[PDB]
C-alpha cells in the first residue's frame, strides 16, 4: 500500500530527472502543491501545473536541466542533483530554530513544515520558527 505520498512524489521527480524526462505526473494534494511551490521559486523545477487525468486531479511538473555537455557522455547536467526525505512515517524529525540544518554551506535548501506554513531554512531562520523537517534538496 501507498504509505508515504511525499516520499513517493520526491522519488517520482528523481526517477524522472535521472532519465531526462521533460515532465512528470503525480497525484495531487495541497501539501504536494506547497512543496512544488517552494521548489518552483528556488528554480529547481521549471514549473508545476494542475491537470486532470480520467477525472482524477494530478500535478504535472515540468523539469529543468543544464546545457548539453561536450565530449563523451553528452548528457546535460542536473539542476536537482540530490533529493532526500528526512522525516518519515515511523521516525518523525522535528527541529527547533537553533537546530535548523545548513545544506552545502547555503548552496542547497531544506524544506520545513513550520507552524507558519511550508518554508525554506532561510525563511524559517528569518521568521525564527522550527518544525517538521520534510526534505533537503541540492
Amino acid at each position: 500500500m501507498l504509505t508515504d505520498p511525499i516520499a513517493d512524489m520526491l522519488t517520482r521527480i528523481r526517477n524522472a530527472t535521472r532519465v531526462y524526462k521533460e515532465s512528470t505526473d503525480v497525484p495531487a494534494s495541497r501539501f504536494k502543491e506547497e512543496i512544488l511551490r517552494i521548489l518552483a521559486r528556488e528554480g529547481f523545477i521549471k514549473g508545476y501545473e494542475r491537470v486532470d487525468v480520467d477525472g482524477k486531479p494530478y500535478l504535472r511538473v515540468y523539469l529543468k536541466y543544464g546545457p548539453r555537455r561536450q565530449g563523451p557522455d553528452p548528457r546535460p547536467e542536473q539542476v536537482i542533483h540530490h533529493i532526500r526525505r528526512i522525516s518519515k512515517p515511523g521516525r518523525r524529525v522535528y527541529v527547533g530554530v537553533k537546530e535548523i540544518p545548513r545544506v552545502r554551506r547555503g548552496l542547497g535548501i531544506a524544506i520545513l513544515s513550520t507552524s507558519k506554513g511550508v518554508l525554506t531554512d532561510r525563511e524559517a531562520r528569518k521568521l525564527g520558527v522550527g518544525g517538521e523537517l520534510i526534505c533537503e534538496v541540492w
Binding site: 561536450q70 565530449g71 563523451p72 553528452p74 548528457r75
Partner: protein
C-alpha cells in the same frame, strides 16, 4: 520536402529495430515501417547546413566516413569532388585516437609510391618486389583519401552512426563535432548535428551528400 519526399528519405526501418530515443523524430508507423517526419528533417537540415557552411568558410576540413556497401561509391565520389579526406573501405581502430601511428603508415605509403616510381627497384629479388607491391596495394586500399589529413579533422561526417560506432566514439573522445545521417535505429544524443533521414536507399545518400558537397563548394 518536394525533393526529400521522392528520394525515399522518410522511409525508416521496421518496428523491430527502432531506438526509443529516436521516437521524437518519428511521424507515424505504416505497413510495418517507421515514417520519419520531414519538417523536423528540414529544420535539422537547415541547422546542420548552417554549421557546415560556417565551417567551410572558416577553413576547416571534414572527414567523410561511411563504409556501407551501397554508400562506398557515393562517399568516394562526393569526397573526391572536394579537398576533404574520406574512409570507405574500413575504419582502422584508432584513426583518430592513434593518429600519429597511422600517419607513419601514410608516410610508408608515400615512400613506397616514390620507390615504385624509381628505377632503383631492380635490386631486391622479384618475390621481395611481390611482397612490397602487396604491402603497397594494401596501404592504398585502406589509406587512400585518408592521405589528405595532415592533422586532426575539424568535423566528421558519418553515413550510419550505428555502423561506424567506433568512429563516433573516437570523435566524442577527442571533442570533434559529429555530423551524421541517422535513421530510426540510431542514438540522437551522440550526434552533434543530426540529419534525420535514411542510411539505405542510394537515392537518399546521393541527395544529402550532393547537397552538402555543393554547399561546401560554393562556400569556398
Amino acid at each position: 520536402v518536394k525533393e526529400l519526399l521522392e528520394a525515399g528519405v522518410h522511409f525508416g526501418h521496421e518496428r523491430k529495430r527502432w531506438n526509443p530515443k529516436f521516437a521524437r523524430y518519428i511521424y507515424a508507423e505504416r505497413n510495418g515501417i517507421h515514417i520519419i517526419d520531414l519538417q523536423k528533417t528540414m529544420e535539422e537540415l537547415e541547422r546542420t547546413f548552417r554549421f557546415i557552411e560556417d565551417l567551410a568558410m572558416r577553413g576547416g576540413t571534414i572527414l567523410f566516413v561511411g563504409t556501407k556497401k551501397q554508400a562506398q561509391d557515393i562517399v568516394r565520389m562526393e569526397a573526391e569532388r572536394a579537398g576533404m579526406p574520406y574512409v570507405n573501405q574500413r575504419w582502422l581502430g584508432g584513426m583518430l585516437t592513434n593518429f600519429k601511428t597511422i600517419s607513419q603508415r601514410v608516410h610508408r605509403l608515400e615512400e613506397l609510391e616514390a620507390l615504385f616510381a624509381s628505377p632503383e627497384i631492380e635490386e631486391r629479388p622479384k618475390k621481395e618486389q611481390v611482397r612490397l607491391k602487396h604491402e603497397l596495394e594494401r596501404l592504398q586500399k585502406y589509406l587512400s583519401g585518408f592521405r589528405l589529413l595532415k592533422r586532426l579533422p575539424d568535423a566528421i561526417f558519418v553515413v550510419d552512426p550505428t555502423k561506424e560506432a567506433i568512429a563516433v566514439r573516437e570523435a566524442r573522445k577527442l571533442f570533434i563535432p559529429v555530423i551524421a545521417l541517422a535513421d530510426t535505429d540510431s542514438d540522437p544524443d551522440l550526434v552533434d548535428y543530426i540529419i534525420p533521414g535514411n542510411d539505405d536507399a542510394i537515392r537518399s545518400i546521393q541527395l544529402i551528400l550532393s547537397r552538402a558537397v555543393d554547399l561546401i563548394i560554393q562556400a569556398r
